[PDB]
Design a protein around this nucleic acid. Structure first.
Ligand SMILES: [Mg+2]
Ligand SMILES: [Mg+2]
Lengths: 137, 123, 132, 45, 101, 295
RNA sequence: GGACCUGGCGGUGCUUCAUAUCCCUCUAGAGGAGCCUGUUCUGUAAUCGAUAAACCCCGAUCAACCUCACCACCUCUUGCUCAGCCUAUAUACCGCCAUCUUCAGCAAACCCUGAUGAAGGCUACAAAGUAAGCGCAAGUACCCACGUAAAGACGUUAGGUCAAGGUGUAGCCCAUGAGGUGGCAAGAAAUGGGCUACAUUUUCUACCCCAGAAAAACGAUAGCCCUUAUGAAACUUAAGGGUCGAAGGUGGAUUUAGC
C-alpha cells in the first residue's frame, strides 16, 4: 500500500544537432573468469534485445601469459615456480545503433561491469564527406 | 618502513623459535599477549573519540572530539602500567598444587573426576 | 618440502578456514582471488599501483579492526569504486563498528581519492572448514 | 611514498586508531631490554 | 622512512633525474646529431658532463618497492620474486595463479 | 537426524520458489536444471573444480528413536554388503534346488551402489559369487540381477553432399600436431588432389608425404577413383601430410562400405594421432632431457 | 646376579627384482682442441653467501658508473626514519626451500590380549582390531580417459639462506652508521658446465628440399683494427665490417641424459 502516488521521470532533452550514427561497436570484455564473462554476455545480450539493438557475440581466443620464478630464496636454481595469467575475451558486436542509444546502452552495461572485467569498446562512426572535399580548392 | 611489518602471531612464531634444529630433538622465553590490556581508541596523544573510546552521549548530548590533558594522560598511563603489573603478578603467581606422597612424586595426586560419558553419563 | 602458504597437520586440533586449508596450487581451482581488479589482465596498466594499494588496505584494515576480522578481506574494484568486504566477529559493540566503518571509509576515500565503501558481514566465530 | 605511508600509520597509532602489532612487539622488546640494562649510549659523548 | 638507505639513494636519484630530465634531453639531442658544428657538440659534451652525476637516468635501479631487493624484480608489479610469490600464493593478487599445462 | 533433513528439504523448496521468482520463471516447472542455470548465472564462478562452484541442491542413520536398527544385519557393520551376499546366496540355493561388451563393476562402483566401504577381498568374494550365479544357468530373474552389476564397455560417418557444379561429394577434417586440414572428396574423379589450390606433387615435393597421401586410397583400392581438394594450415610438411591423410580417410569413409570403414579403422587411418610436442619443464634442458648431472 | 621385552645396524649369501634403470645392449654426448662461463688456487688495498649426492651460466629472469654490501682517500654526527648497522649467531627462528620423494606411509582417538609386566594385536572357507585426519589416490590444469605438470605427509641430514625481508640473543653509536670521488675483476694453474667444430649425411649460393659449385679445404662468437648501437662516460658491453685462418682431424680410464 505504500507505493508512490506519482513518480518523477528523468529529464530528457531533444537537441536540434543531428545524432551521431554508429555503424558498429565492438565491446571486447576481458576477464579472468569464463563464468563471469558468460554471465555478463547474457546480461548484455538480454539488455540489447530488450532495447531492440542488433547484437552478435563471439569469443576471441584466450591469452595465457606465463612466467617463471625461483622457488627458494638463496640458491635452488634447478627448482622454480611457474605462474600464469589467463585473459579470456568476449566480443559483443552491436550494429546499426544511434549515438543516444549507444551512449545509454554503454552506460547501462558499464555501470554493471563486474569487478575484474575490463572493457575495450571500439565505435565505428559513420561520417559524411567534409565540406571542402567535394571539390578542389 | 611500513610494508615490512607483520602480524603479532608471525612475530611471536619467529621470536620464540618453537621449531628448529634445537627444538627438533632437544639437541627461556614465553609468548605474551599485547592486546589483553589495550583498548581501541587509546593512543599516546590521549585523544577522546566519541563513540569508540568514550561514551557517545554525555548529559544526553553528542560528545565532540576531546584531548586529555598532560596530567590526565599521565594518570591514564599510570593506570595502564598498574594494570599490566597486576596482571603480570597474577600470571606469575599460581594456586599451589597439593603434593602427593612426596613433593616431586606423582602418586597420590588427584586428577579430578573422569570425563563424562557420551550417553548422558557423568562421573 | 613446499612450505609456502600451507597449514601443516600436527594433531588434528588447529582450526583453519577455507582459505588457509587450501594450498596455493588450488587458487584457480578451489579458492578465487581475494582481490579483483583489471590491472593484471592483458594490455592493462597500473598493476603495481593496484598491488601496493591492496597491500596497504589489507595492513590498514587489519590494524583498524584489531582482533575483529574473522578472515582475509575481499577487495573489489569497479571503475573508480573500491569495495572492501570483511568478515568480522561479533565481539565488538555495534557503536564501535559503525564508528570504524565511517572513519575507515572517509580516510581511505581521502587517501586514495576514490569512493571507498566497507561492507561488514558478522559471524559469531571464525568459521572452521576443517581441523589440522 | 613510503614517507607518507609510514608517517600516516605512525600518526594513526599515536591517535589510537591503528593498533600496530609489529610496533607493539618492538616496544615491548625495547622495554624488556631497558629493564635488562641494555640501552643506547649518548651520541657524541 | 624507506626500506633501506639504498632505496633512499634510488629515490634521490629518481627525483634528481626527473628534475634534470629536460636539460639532459636538450643537451643530448644537441650532441646526438651530425648536423651541428663539432665545436658546439664539444661544448655540449662538456655541459652534459658538468651536470651532477646522480642526474643520469642510467644510475636509476629498479629495486623492489617493498623490500629494496635490487635483482629479481618483475617490472609489471615492481616486486621482488619472494614478495610476489608470497602475495600470489596467498591469492591477494588478482588473476595470477599457478601455471600447470 | 531425519528432522534436520526434512528442515533442509523445506528450506530448499522455499529457496527454489524464491529463485523462480527472481528469474521470472514459473515456480511449478522450475526444475533442477533451471536451478543450476540460474545459480551459475547469478553467482558466476570460474573455479575449475566443479565441486567447488556454488550449488543449490536437494548418508542416513540406521536406527529409529527407540534405538532398534531397521536392518536385521545391522550389527555386522556392513549391512548392505552382507544383505546383498545373503540375497545372492539365496538365489543360488533356489537355482541349485530347481536343478561380449559387458564387465563386472569395479570396487568403487560397488561401494557407490552399496553406499558402504568394502575391502578388496570382500569385492573378490562378491564377484566370485556373481560368476557362480552366472555359470549356474541362471534365469532372467537372476540375469537382471547380474546386469545390475554389469557395465558396458563405431565411427560416425559424414553424409554425402552436393555442390553447385552438380558433383556428389563428402567433406571432413583432421589434425596432426599443430596442423589442421579440411578435405573434400568427390564420389567420382580421376585421382587429382589439390592442396590449397596447388597440385599435390608440387605442394609436397617430399616423396614420404605423397606416400602418406596415397595410403588411404590405396588401402581401400581406390586410386584414381576420386578427386580431392584440401585446405591445410599450420605445422610442417609431415604434420600437414598426416592431417590431410586423416581428413581424406574420414571423408572417404562416406563412400566405402562399412567393412572397409572398419578395416581402415583397424589400419589406423581414422584414429587422430594424439602425439603432440611435450612442454619443456623448468630445471631440465628439454621435455625429458635433464641437465648434465654434475658430481 | 636370574628370567624376559623391545632391539638394531653385518663390504653375510640365496631366490626374485629395478625399465632410461643396477649392468650389458640403443642413441647422442662429456672426458681430446678452441672459445664462453662458474668455481678453486695465485695475486690485489679491494665483498659475501653456495661447497658429495642435494655447490659449481648457483643467489643474478645478470656487476662499465649506480648496482655494492669491497678497498683506498676525504667528509657528516639525534643522522630520510620517535635513528641506523649487509655487525656476530641459519647451532635461536619465522619466512622460502633442498634431500630420500623416480617414496606410502604418518597417524591422533578408542578397543582387546599378556593375571591389567617392559609389550602385542596376523589368518578371507578369516582367529581383535577399528580408525577420524594427513599423504598417496581422487579431482583439476594442458590436447582424452593417456601422458606431462601440479601435487608429494610424517620424518632424515643441528641440510641452505640473519646478504629478500622480519625477528630472538649479543655488539658498534665521533662509527662496525651515513655521504662523495677513485679503484679491483689478472693468470702459473686445476676443475665443472656450455657453445662452435674437427666436414662429404659436409661447405658456399639459389631455393626452402629434382640445382650448380667447393672439397686440404673444413674450422674462432678468439686476437688486432674500424664503425655503429646504448650511455654523461665503451679501454672494459653488444652488433657489424675488415684483417688474421690458428688449435683441432671424433678424443683414455671414466661419465651424463633419454622409453
Ligand atoms: Mg621438594
Ligand atoms: Mg681483487
Amino acid at each position: 500500500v505504500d507505493v508512490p502516488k506519482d513518480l518523477t521521470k528523468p529529464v530528457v532533452t531533444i537537441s536540434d544537432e543531428p545524432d551521431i550514427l554508429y555503424k558498429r561497436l565492438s565491446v571486447l570484455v576481458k576477464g579472468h573468469d569464463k563464468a563471469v564473462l558468460d554471465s555478463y554476455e547474457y546480461f548484455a545480450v538480454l539488455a540489447a534485445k530488450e532495447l531492440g539493438i542488433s547484437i552478435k557475440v563471439h569469443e576471441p581466443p584466450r591469452k595465457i601469459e606465463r612466467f617463471t620464478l625461483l622457488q627458494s630464496v638463496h640458491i635452488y636454481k634447478k627448482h622454480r615456480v611457474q605462474y600464469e595469467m589467463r585473459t579470456l575475451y568476449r566480443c559483443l558486436e552491436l550494429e546499426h545503433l544511434t549515438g543516444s542509444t549507444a551512449d545509454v546502452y554503454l552506460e547501462y552495461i558499464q555501470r554493471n561491469l563486474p569487478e575484474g572485467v575490463a572493457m575495450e569498446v571500439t565505435k565505428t562512426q559513420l561520417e559524411q564527406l567534409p565540406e571542402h572535399i567535394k571539390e578542389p580548392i | 618502513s611500513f610494508f615490512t611489518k607483520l602480524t603479532a602471531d608471525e612475530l611471536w612464531k619467529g621470536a620464540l623459535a618453537e621449531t628448529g634444529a634445537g627444538a627438533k630433538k632437544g639437541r627461556k622465553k614465553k609468548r605474551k599477549d599485547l592486546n589483553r590490556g589495550q583498548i581501541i581508541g587509546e593512543g599516546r596523544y590521549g585523544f577522546l573519540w566519541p563513540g569508540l573510546n568514550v561514551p557517545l552521549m554525555k548529559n544526553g548530548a553528542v560528545q565532540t572530539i576531546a584531548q586529555r590533558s598532560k596530567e590526565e594522560q599521565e594518570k591514564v598511563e599510570a593506570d595502564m602500567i598498574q594494570q599490566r603489573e597486576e596482571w603480570d603478578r597474577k600470571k606469575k603467581m599460581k594456586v599451589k598444587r597439593e603434593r602427593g606422597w612426596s613433593g616431586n612424586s606423582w602418586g597420590g595426586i588427584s586428577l579430578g573426576p573422569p570425563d563424562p560419558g557420551p550417553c548422558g553419563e557423568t562421573y | 618440502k613446499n612450505r609456502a602458504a600451507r597449514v601443516r597437520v600436527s594433531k588434528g586440533d588447529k582450526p583453519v578456514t577455507y582459505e588457509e586449508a587450501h594450498a596455493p596450487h588450488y587458487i584457480a581451482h578451489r579458492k578465487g582471488w581475494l582481490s579483483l581488479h583489471t590491472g593484471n589482465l592483458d594490455g592493462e596498466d597500473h598493476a603495481a599501483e593496484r598491488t601496493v594499494e591492496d597491500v596497504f588496505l589489507r595492513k590498514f584494515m587489519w590494524g583498524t579492526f584489531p582482533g575483529c576480522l574473522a578472515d582475509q578481506l575481499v577487495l573489489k574494484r569497479r571503475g573508480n569504486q573500491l569495495e572492501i568486504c570483511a568478515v568480522v566477529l561479533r565481539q565488538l559493540s555495534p557503536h564501535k563498528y559503525y564508528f570504524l566503518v565511517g572513519y575507515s571509509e572517509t580516510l581511505l576515500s581521502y587517501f586514495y581519492k576514490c569512493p571507498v565503501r566497507l561492507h561488514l558481514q558478522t559471524v559469531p566465530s571464525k568459521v572452521v572448514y576443517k581441523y589440522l | 611514498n613510503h614517507h607518507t605511508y609510514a608517517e600516516l600509520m605512525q600518526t594513526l597509532r599515536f591517535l589510537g586508531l591503528y593498533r600496530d602489532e609489529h610496533q607493539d612487539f618492538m616496544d615491548e622488546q625495547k622495554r624488556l631490554k631497558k629493564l635488562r640494562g641494555k640501552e643506547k649510549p649518548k651520541k657524541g659523548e | 622512512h624507506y626500506v633501506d638507505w639504498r632505496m633512499w639513494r634510488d629515490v634521490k636519484r629518481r627525483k634528481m633525474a626527473y628534475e634534470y630530465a629536460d636539460e639532459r634531453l636538450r643537451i643530448n639531442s644537441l650532441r646526438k646529431n651530425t648536423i651541428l658544428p663539432k665545436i658546439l657538440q664539444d661544448v655540449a659534451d662538456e655541459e652534459i658532463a658538468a651536470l651532477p652525476r646522480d642526474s643520469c637516468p642510467v644510475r636509476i635501479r629498479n629495486r623492489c618497492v617493498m623490500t629494496s631487493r635490487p635483482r629479481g624484480v618483475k617490472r609489471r608489479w615492481r616486486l621482488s620474486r619472494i614478495v610476489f610469490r608470497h602475495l600470489a600464493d596467498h591469492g591477494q593478487l588478482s588473476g595470477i595463479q599457478r601455471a600447470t599445462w | 537426524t531425519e528432522d534436520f533433513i526434512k528442515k533442509q528439504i523445506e528450506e530448499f523448496n522455499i529457496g527454489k520458489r524464491h529463485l523462480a521468482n527472481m528469474m521470472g520463471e514459473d515456480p511449478e516447472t522450475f526444475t533442477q536444471e533451471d536451478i543450476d542455470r540460474a545459480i551459475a548465472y547469478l553467482f558466476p564462478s570460474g573455479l575449475f573444480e566443479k565441486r567447488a562452484r556454488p550449488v543449490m541442491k536437494h548418508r542416513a542413520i540406521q536406527w529409529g528413536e527407540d534405538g532398534r536398527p531397521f536392518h536385521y544385519l545391522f550389527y555386522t557393520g556392513k549391512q548392505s554388503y552382507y544383505s546383498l551376499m545373503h540375497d545372492v546366496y539365496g538365489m543360488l540355493l533356489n537355482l541349485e534346488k530347481h536343478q561380449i561388451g559387458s564387465r563386472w563393476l569395479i570396487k568403487e562402483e560397488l561401494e557407490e551402489m552399496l553406499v558402504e566401504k568394502l575391502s578388496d577381498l570382500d569385492y573378490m568374494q562378491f564377484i566370485r559369487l556373481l560368476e557362480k550365479l552366472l555359470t549356474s544357468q541362471c534365469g532372467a530373474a537372476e540375469e537382471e540381477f547380474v546386469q545390475r552389476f554389469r557395465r558396458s564397455v563405431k565411427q560416425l560417418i559424414e553424409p554425402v553432399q552436393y555442390d553447385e557444379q552438380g558433383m556428389a561429394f563428402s567433406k571432413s577434417e583432421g589434425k596432426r600436431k599443430t596442423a589442421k586440414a579440411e578435405a573434400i572428396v568427390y564420389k567420382h574423379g580421376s585421382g587429382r588432389i589439390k592442396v590449397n589450390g596447388i597440385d599435390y606433387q608440387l605442394y609436397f615435393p617430399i616423396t614420404q608425404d605423397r606416400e602418406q597421401l596415397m595410403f588411404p586410397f590405396h588401402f581401400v583400392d581406390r586410386l584414381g577413383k576420386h578427386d580431392v581438394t584440401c585446405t591445410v594450415s599450420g605445422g610442417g610438411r609431415s604434420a600437414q601430410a598426416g592431417a590431410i591423410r586423416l581428413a581424406m580417410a574420414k571423408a572417404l569413409c562416406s563412400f566405402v562400405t562399412e567393412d572397409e570403414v572398419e578395416w581402415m579403422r583397424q589400419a589406423g587411418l581414422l584414429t587422430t594421432d594424439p602425439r603432440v610436442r611435450e612442454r619443456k619443464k623448468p630445471g631440465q634442458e628439454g621435455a625429458r632431457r635433464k641437465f648434465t648431472w654434475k658430481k
